[PDB]
Amino acid sequence: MRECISIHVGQAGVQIGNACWELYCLEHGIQPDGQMPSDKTIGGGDDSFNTFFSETGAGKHVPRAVFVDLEPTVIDEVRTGTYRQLFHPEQLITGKEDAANNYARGHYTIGKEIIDLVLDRIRKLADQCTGLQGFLVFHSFGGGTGSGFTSLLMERLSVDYGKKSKLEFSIYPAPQVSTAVVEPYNSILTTHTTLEHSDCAFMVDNEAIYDICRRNLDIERPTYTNLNRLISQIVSSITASLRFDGALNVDLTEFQTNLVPYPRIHFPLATYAPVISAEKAYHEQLSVAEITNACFEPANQMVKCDPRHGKYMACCLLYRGDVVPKDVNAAIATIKTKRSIQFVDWCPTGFKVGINYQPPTVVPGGDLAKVQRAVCMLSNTTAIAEAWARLDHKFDLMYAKRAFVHWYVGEGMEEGEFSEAREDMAALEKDYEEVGVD
Amino acid sequence: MEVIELNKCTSGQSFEVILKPPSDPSLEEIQKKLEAAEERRKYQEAELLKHLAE
Amino acid sequence: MYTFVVRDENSSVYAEVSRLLLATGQWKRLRKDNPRFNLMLGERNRLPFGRLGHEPGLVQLVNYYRGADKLCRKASLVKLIKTSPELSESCTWFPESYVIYPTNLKTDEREVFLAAYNRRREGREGNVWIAKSEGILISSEASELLDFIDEQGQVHVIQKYLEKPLLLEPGHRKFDIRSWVLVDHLYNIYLYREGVLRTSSEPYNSANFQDKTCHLTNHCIQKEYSKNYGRYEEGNEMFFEEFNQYLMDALNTTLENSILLQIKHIIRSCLMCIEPAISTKHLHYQSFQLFGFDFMVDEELKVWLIEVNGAPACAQKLYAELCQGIVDVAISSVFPLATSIFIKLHHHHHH
Amino acid sequence: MREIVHIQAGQCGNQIGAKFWEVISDEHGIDPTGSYHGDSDLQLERINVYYNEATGNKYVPRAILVDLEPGTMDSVRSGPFGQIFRPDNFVFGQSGAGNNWAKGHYTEGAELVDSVLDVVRKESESCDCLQGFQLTHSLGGGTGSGMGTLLISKIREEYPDRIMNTFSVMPSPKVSDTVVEPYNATLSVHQLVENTDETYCIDNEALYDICFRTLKLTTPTYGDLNHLVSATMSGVTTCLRFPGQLNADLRKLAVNMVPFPRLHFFMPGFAPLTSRGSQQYRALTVPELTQQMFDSKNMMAACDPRHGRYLTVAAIFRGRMSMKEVDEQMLNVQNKNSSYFVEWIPNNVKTAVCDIPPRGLKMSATFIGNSTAIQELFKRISEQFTAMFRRKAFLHWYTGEGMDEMEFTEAESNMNDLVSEYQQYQDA
Ligand SMILES: Nc1nc2c(ncn2[C@@H]2O[C@H](COP(=O)(O)OP(=O)(O)OP(=O)(O)O)[C@@H](O)[C@H]2O)c(=O)[nH]1
Ligand SMILES: Nc1ncnc2c1ncn2[C@@H]1O[C@H](COP(=O)(O)OP(=O)(O)CP(=O)(O)O)[C@@H](O)[C@H]1O
Ligand SMILES: Nc1nc2c(ncn2[C@@H]2O[C@H](COP(=O)(O)OP(=O)(O)O)[C@@H](O)[C@H]2O)c(=O)[nH]1
Ligand SMILES: [Ca+2]
Ligand SMILES: [Ca+2]
Ligand SMILES: [Ca+2]
Ligand SMILES: [Cl-]
Ligand SMILES: [Mg+2]
Ligand SMILES: [Mg+2]
Ligand SMILES: [Mg+2]
Ligand SMILES: [Mg+2]
Asked: At which residues is Phosphoserine found (chain B)?
């Protein structure tokens, strides 16, 4: 058994961590006070849920989590909400004044005064680990904290814990819920300074989650609560193999080995089916074939792109519920006949498959219905580079006029870092095009 | 179309199906970057207060 | 008021589509790089499909199908026909063709080309081929072809020259047929009922191959190297009533039985093959596209597909009608306002 | 980023500031003695932004009241909400400033400003995290204009890393106390361009016309003008006063609204327009709110938005209503008028909704545009300036207090530069 530390940074990061830790406790049968009646090794152990929870002498199971925000209100709602008892105070770090949607304010100005406090509260958790795998980092591209502070944190994690793997769950900016005009700036900036420090990143475009909510949850105008319970479902699919007995993605190194053959192209697409409204009166439950087929609809992806005009480098199918290999192979066989799936010439055309027999857990009184079987597909397709195209375009449009740049320079950044980051992104876009177009 | 490396346990099973074979910077470089930005900040603030002093 | 943008100004077709769109008073053109458009009439190369379908409150539509270049580049089309089981190397309406790269570069089926040509060497069959990729050449011995291929820079196809073409009289000359296909956002395949015969004006001469005016029927070429251009038909362009009347009077058929059945079959087989790779049925933006299918009729009244064009121009007199047709069935079907000129190609045989 | 410090200076500054505190105390359920008597606790969640907490759980406006003469401040003290203000935060001289920027900035105002700064520091030291300052004043008299820009210079000296926010009433001949008003405005605009982060340009011309043309008041008073201003100020600060996602503090608002440091002069607007008596009873529908709030005749700065282009827009909807409907409506106004929004700032219209409506209305919409059409305002001032300045008329009132013509020439130059900088982006 080897422990994973989750770090949630900013509003988006903290609120998503809230959702995921709620979910995790439901799935592992841990209750709000932190007691786990099913754990009979009292006071410790090396079961695989211990990967995410530590144990205390009193029977309390404590997330290996740190929440960091530069302003107090959101982490205050953690400190005071239904899982108040779950977390130890030293795991919740607030500032007094936030980063005002300014990458440079979060990275340089305010990051510097709190980076050391954060690294010490992290070291405190690492010191309770017999073998630490590395880190799961939750944050948004768009916020000032979530973008700027995260990148500072990642630089210093690579120095302080250099042999450890680091994974991101990154929230990509969408105008339907975005809070700032400079969110493309922040995104490019933090992608550029975090690229070499992160081994695998799962992007989630708020536009895709938003429309999944509208279209398949019958939600008229989704809130962050709607968005976040869906996102946590997907996150739990992605992490269930660290938290449960199995032989696929049992550690963080395996995610890179299985989904990332080239280190910079480390952005796997996540597709998830089925998303079914809890207020659906009559629902015919879906087959292995139907949900695996849904995995290849763009409408089910965390980022809206078209994988038909790209190439695959890797594809994992994580099933949860009642699934057996023969149905999966039947489904794959017929899907390949009817669909445009082409891998790169230097990679097997195959699917690594993982099945956990426990169906997806859904939050009581949520939007999601219970189902008999569900799948999360993780596919490293070059088509995700569409999302960079979009972002880079917006960036160019503003930076051509240096609009808003002065807010960054006034925090101590230098105009030129804007274009070093933009040129790194140009390198990135062309890496994708080399690998996946002819 | 071959199923390979199949593993089973009470809680699940995992396998691979193949359809077709293949056809950093240092601690103080960082406190350098951060202190260069802080000094840029303090220079701009000082030019502001020299202008206000005039 | 719907809003649209124009990023191909060298487009004869969509220029008139812009004009007709504006003169509705329900469409307003915006400037080339403004995001908040309903419809993009896009550039040819490097059209940014990645940026389409992401402006909330705007159903977006574009006059190109991402990935349809597979059908509209010569090498891509040869590869698509050979590799895809629905068409196959057994295909009866495509000429025997092979993809050849210059050895300046180094996949390529040159070794496979000469085996077929050698059994036709050996079998006293006609064995003239065309090399294509303005840069074409027709010849009976292979060496000519391959070394021509390589003193250019880029990738070519080598295709059986149709040695016995149907020849219109008076003239004893060649022709090709161009059909205008329009695929809407739902993947209805509309054939435009007016095609055109791009004719030659010089009698077809089987002996001296290098004189390319009797052999190549491009509107370009016969307006430049041809003595009689404009003698028989205006602009070397015969339309479907005259061609039908000729088939009736001279050969006892009609155009629909002798030729059009096959053309509709080829169009629908070609597009229904690529449908799962380019369909925009469940996508966040939607495509339509105007294609130009180019056919050759041999002397036995059997049709062969020559090439597919992704950005075709219309023959002058037909612009008005076809362009209106693009507005009614491709554009206004997505964006409603306050006798039809297409055959919808559909066929569900049971087996 | 919580506490704001409020300063109101001069006759106009203090009359509108008094109306502002009446309006927002009523919204936050606070009575003229500072006792809280409310229903929803959305009223108190961010009330410390504008109020300090006192001994009998009473609420004191974080408000400093400044004048060079005591008339208007005396009337505020006896006004309906007068006793709610901290009595030591009233700071005033006796001289008056005689509609004279130079007395405000250099002579009479210099005497008083140090005591104003003492009270300002006493308020700042109590703040757990100060956001910055908002000043209300006119730019056409002397105390508000001259001393208010003096105060802004001192405050930026003592707190260079806090946001400076102003509501600045521009002068119009249509509503005009003295002929030297363009002089006072030009001088003041020169300070505002350099020393504030966000300025709401409240044009007395536009307030007059809204009272006259659409509200059908024949002879509008400063009371009728301040009604409009109180409601607009409420609306442009609602995102700061209630729990909220968007433009929720002075700095994030600045980051969202100000793409270039000098171009921070905002055009505010309000819908529906109310005459203080008529009490009109019709339901306003979301498409109606959205079409009105964007219409020139609902805008407090007398400019034609179609003569320019929006760099940024902040919209705020107040009332119980469909956020699906407002999202749809906002996208339809931008998608059907995309010409008027710069294409090189993507998604520059940001929109907020708050449950509590203002008093008297079930539904309301406040608009804050950083339009380049605002140049029109400044151009008008500069014409009125030059007409006098080219004969150096009325200058003695200023040169007698030590000023030189060259200061006037610099101020004129800098305003004409500001308008050229606005027009640089209107053609791009
Ligand atoms: N999906 C999702 N997105 C969120 C959530 N909260 C904020 N966002 C998005 O994140 C971006 C804003 O970033 P935030 O995380 O709120 O900002 P921050 O990291 O706290 O940085 P500062 O507030 O500037 O200190 C916008 O795109 C929002 O749409 C959330 O809870 N869920
Ligand atoms: N296999 C073949 N056999 C006989 N003739 C052929 C032939 N292929 C092409 N041709 C002749 O060459 C001409 C077609 O050239 P090509 O197919 O390359 O079109 P193109 O790309 O030059 C211009 P456009 O797009 O307007 O048709 C036809 O008119 C035909 O007469
Ligand atoms: N909107 C509005 N404008 C006012 C009011 N009182 C004065 N003004 C305007 O302010 C200018 C005069 O400035 P004023 O505040 O009276 O002088 P000060 O006390 O020395 O700053 C003139 O342009 C008046 O139109 C008011 O109550 N409301
Ligand atoms: Ca245990
Ligand atoms: Ca590393
Ligand atoms: Ca004195
Ligand atoms: Cl290490
Ligand atoms: Mg925050
Ligand atoms: Mg062609
Ligand atoms: Mg003193
Ligand atoms: Mg006065």
From this structure: 26
Are A297 and C282 a contacting pair at CB < 8 A? yes
Phi then psi for residue D274, to 5 deg, are -120, 140
Whether D265 contacts D374, CB under 8 Å: yes
Which CATH number fits the domain that encloses residue C52? Answer: 3.40.50.11480
Cβ contact C77:C71 at 8 Å: yes
Q: B38: distance to nearest CA of chain A, Å?
A: 6
Do residues C191 and C317 share a domain? yes
Q: Tell me, yes or no, if B53 comes closer than 8 A to chain A by beta carbon.
A: no
Is C35's Cβ below 8 Å from some Cβ in D? Answer: yes
DSSP strands (E only) in A65-187: 65-69, 92-94, 132-140, 165-172
Sequence-distant (≥ 6) Cβ neighbours of residue D196 within 8 angstroms: D152, D164, D165, D166, D264
Task: Report the distance separating Cα A53 and Cα A243, nearest Å.
Answer: 9
Nearest ligand 2 atom to alpha carbon C174: 31
Q: What is the rounded CA–CA span in Å between residue D306 and residue D319?
A: 29
Confirm if D294 and D263 have CB atoms less than 8 A apart. Answer: no
Residue A347, phi then psi, degrees to nearest 5: -140, 140
How far away is chain A from the Cα of B26, in angstroms, using its nearest Cα? 7
Query: Please, are residues C178 and C198 in contact by the beta-carbon 8 Å criterion?
Result: yes
Domain-wise residue ranges, chain A = 1-268, 269-383, 384-438
Among B residues 27-46, those touching chain A with beta carbons less than 8 Å apart: 27, 30, 34, 36-41, 44
User: What Rg do the C-alpha atoms of chain D give, in angstroms?
Assistant: 20
Residue of A nearest to B6 (CA): A247
Is the distance from CB of D15 to CB of D8 less than 8 angstroms? Answer: no
CATH number, domain containing residue C336: 3.30.470.20
All chains having 3 or more CB pairs closer than 8 angstroms to chain C: A, D
Query: Which ligand 2 atom sits closest to the C-alpha of C198?
Result: 29
Contacts of C73 in chain A (CB under 8 A): none
**In angstroms, how far is the first alpha carbon of chain A from the final one?**
44
The DSSP line for D257-309 is H-SSTT--EEEEEEES---SS----PPPPHHHHHHHHTSGGGBSS---GGGS-
Q: Hey, what are D132's tokens? A: 């910055």
Q: Whose CA is nearest to atom 26 of ligand 1?
A: A178
Q: Name every residue whose Cβ is closer than 8 Å to that of residue C204 and which is 6 or more positions away in sequence.
A: C165, C167, C172, C173, C174, C214, C215
d(CA A132, CA A1): 9
Alpha-carbon gap, residue B48 to B51, rounded angstroms: 5
Q: Which ligand 3 atom sits nearest the alpha carbon of residue D144?
A: 21
- Phi and psi based region of residue A402 (left: phi greater than 0; alpha: psi -120 to 50; beta: remaining): left
C192/C308 same-domain check: yes
Residues C46 and C172 in one domain: no
Sign of the Cα torsion D217, D222, D227, D229 reads: positive
Burial category of A299 from C-beta neighbours within 10 Å (exposed 0-12, middle 13-18, buried 19 and up)? middle
Residue A76, both tokens:
């205050």
Q: State how far the Cα of C36 lies from the Cα of D67, in Å rounded to an integer.
A: 50
Q: Say yes or no: C309 and C173 in one domain.
A: yes
Question: How many residues in chain B?
Answer: 54
The letter for the amino acid at C324 is Q
Sign of the dihedral through C-alpha C121, C123, C125, C130: negative
Residue C238 domain boundaries: 68-71+166-345
Question: How many C-beta neighbours within 10 Å does residue B51 have?
Answer: 9
Q: Helix-strand-coil percent breakdown of chain A, rounded to 5?
A: 45, 20, 35
Q: What is the resolution of this structure in A?
A: 2.8
B–D CB contacts, 8 A cutoff, strictly below: 9
Closest CA to D325 of D364, D366, D287: D287
